[PDB]
């Protein structure tokens, strides 16, 4: 096959993105992508994934201990599967509703022995994607209870103490998994270059088969979502091809190599780079780019990022544009690296890319953008399809948001030239639009903004999907007000919304929600959180607009402060069909 835990975490993230429902769709989907398997070797795999990358093996007694139980869970899960859907198929048969009371206490119970057995102590890391898939199931059994508990016979008692147990672990799974992905992220760091490529691997890798799957876990609370949700991964990830294809490692280069991707940043949308081509007794290269970009639903005006790199005129610039059909998808790179026996400035070092080409997702094809040649550096390898039983063009996980550039040196006067873009790389699920469904509960992470007024963007706490909106105090000034606006999009005119905010607080605070024009909510909020940074689960609640309003309201939603004290972080903004 050649597939990696990855490819399979991708296509989870995939499933759970798009049909997050209760029902036998979602119980036998997670069969199909992940539970449905015949022996040890897939979870072997996703072991080994994480052992390799920082150069541990599990100690050999917890490690067949863990895969042993995992086999154990993948068995019994299938019998719970196939009794849900005869359930389903027959909902009044009491043999059936005995069933899966049976069945759901022994999937029950199992998982809770289970998982401490994948948080084994000094091996929390290699042990965190086999644990976050047994959270995931987990939860999602314990959602089942909830929805169909009653329906199956289970007395209001039952059903109300599972449901106390879904919301607590919602919480505490993912703070675990936040807490050991932090743990393994910082173990890795490391001074040089070599470090920073094996850092930014683990947060890559570990992004796509942790974070991203947590980042839907409060998805399960099926009081808050009793219909489908969906949810948008608004994160970047890097690929870096100089880089990550040189075998050398540049020393204490590793801090300017992380600062050279760009800040928290309200998401936009890449439009077109410009690049420069400098040169150096004969060879060509990328010595230097131009971003324009927009902002989410090209609602402003197009902008222009300063310079990366130097402006080279060896040869005509170059303008790839990016926005066609569902983006670039994919980055085929040609590496440069000279080397010389005698170095100085009129025989360098270099370490840059001479070629790159661009292709782009789209439903039929598209001929790739070429900056002078293809190369064999893909990004494909690092960031694959989220369906792979299609072209990659059309089964794609992410497009090229942006490229910034770790550079060093200067042509006319260095020995050593770098110039290495940094390509960064958004989940396709962060849509280009901010669309309200009809027929489901739309997530809008705040993020998705394009106006945002005394406040600033900042770093997610890894289980949100994204970053967040930090709205500040007014200084008692009504005119200096926090404010997040966002551009939305109704396909259908007559469906009522109720709107609903995702936020944390460390006081209560008085919130105004707008849409269009209309204040739809204003009042205080309770506090939810005992401090701002260092955002656990729990800290994040909800509020909500009392009535429901139809598309008429306007185009734009948003949120004011008005506290003139206390700042508030808002995640992201829910619209709940009625």
Request: no cysteine.
């Given at each position: ?8 975490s ?5 499933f759970?993105?798009?049909?997050f429902?209760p029902?036998?769709?979602?119980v ?29 093996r ?16 993948s ?8 009794s849900?859907?005869e ?12 069933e ?12 809770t ?11 929390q ?8 898939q ?20 289970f ?9 106390n ?15 050991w992905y932090?743990?393994?992220l ?6 040089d270059?070599?470090?920073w490529?094996?850092?930014n691997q ?26 489908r949700?969906?949810?948008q991964?608004?994160?970047?990830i ?16 590793a ?17 077109s780079?410009?690049?420069?081509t400098?040169?150096?007794r004969?060879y ?5 780019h ?5 902002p989410?639903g090209?609602s ?8 990366y ?12 544009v990016?926005?066609?059909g ?20 009129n025989?360098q ?9 661009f ?8 001929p790739?953008?070429?900056?002078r040649?293809?190369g ?7 960031i694959?399809?989220?369906?792979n ?11 090229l ?12 006067s260095?020995?050593s030239?770098?110039?290495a873009?940094?390509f960064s790389?958004?989940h ?8 309200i469904?009809?027929?489901?509960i739309?997530?809008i992470?705040?993020?998705?903004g394009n ?23 007014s200084?008692?000034?009504?005119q ?6 966002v551009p ?10 109720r ?11 008085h ?13 205080t ?41 206390a ?12």
């Open positions: 096959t050649g597939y990696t835990p990855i490819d399979i991708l296509s989870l993230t995939q759970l993105l798009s049909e429902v029902g036998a769709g979602f036998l989907g997670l069969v199909d992508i992940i539970w449905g398997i015949f022996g040890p070797s897939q979870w072997d795999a996703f072991l080994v994934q994480i052992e390799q990358l920082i150069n541990q599990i100690e050999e007694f917890a490690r067949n201990q863990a895969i042993s139980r995992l086999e154990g869970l068995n019994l899960y299938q019998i719970y599967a196939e849900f859907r359930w389903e198929a027959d909902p009044t048969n009491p043999a059936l509703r005995e899966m009371r049976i069945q759901f206490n022994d999937m029950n119970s199992a998982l022995t289970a998982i401490p057995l994948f948080a084994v102590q000094n091996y890391v290699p042990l965190l994607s086999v644990y976050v047994a959270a995931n199931l987990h939860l999602s059994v314990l959602r089942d209870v909830s929805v169909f508990g009653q329906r199956w016979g007395d209001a008692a039952t059903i109300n103490s599972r449901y147990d879904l919301t607590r672990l919602i919480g505490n799974y993912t703070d675990y998994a936040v807490r932090n743990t393994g910082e173990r890795v760091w490391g001074p270059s070599r470090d490529v094996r850092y683990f947060r890559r890798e570990l992004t796509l088969t942790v974070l991203d799957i947590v980042a839907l876990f409060p998805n399960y609370d099926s009081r808050r979502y009793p219909i949700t969906v949810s991964l608004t994160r970047e890097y690929t870096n091809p100089v880089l990550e294809n040189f075998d050398g490692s540049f020393r204490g280069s801090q300017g190599i992380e600062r050279s991707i760009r800040s928290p940043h309200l998401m936009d949308i890449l439009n780079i410009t690049i420069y400098d040169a150096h004969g060509y290269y990328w010595s230097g131009q971003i324009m970009a927009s989410v090209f402003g005006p197009e902008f222009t990022f300063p310079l790199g130097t402006m080279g005129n060896a040869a005509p610039q170059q303008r790839i990016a926005q066609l569902q983006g670039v998808y994919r980055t085929l790179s040609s590496t440069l690296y000279r080397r010389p026996f005698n170095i100085g400035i025989n070092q270099l370490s840059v890319l001479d070629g790159t080409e292709a782009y997702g789209t439903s039929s094809n598209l790739s953008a070429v900056y040649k293809s064999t550096v893909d990004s494909l390898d690092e694959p399809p989220q369906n039983n299609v072209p990659p063009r059309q089964g794609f996980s992410h497009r948001s942006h490229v910034s550039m770790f550079r060093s040196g200067f042509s006319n260095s020995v030239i770098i110039r873009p940094m790389w958004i396709r699920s962060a849509e280009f639009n901010n669309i469904a009809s027929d489901s739309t997530q992470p705040a993020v998705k106006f945002l007024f005394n406040g600033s963007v900042i770093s997610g706490p890894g289980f949100t999907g994204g970053d967040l909106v930090r709205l500040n105090s200084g008692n000034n009504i200096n007000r926090g404010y997040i606006e939305i999009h109704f396909p259908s005119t007559s469906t009522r919304y709107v609903r905010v995702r936020y944390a607080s460390v006081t209560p605070i919130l105004n929600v707008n849409w269009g024009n209309s204040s739809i909510f204003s009042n909020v309770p506090a939810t959180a005992t401090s701002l940074d260092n955002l656990q689960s729990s800290d994040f609640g909800y509020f909500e607009s009392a009535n429901a309003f139809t598309s008429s309201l306007g185009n734009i939603v948003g949120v004011r402060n008005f506290s003139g004290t700042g508030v972080i808002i995640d992201r903004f829910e619209f709940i069909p009625v």
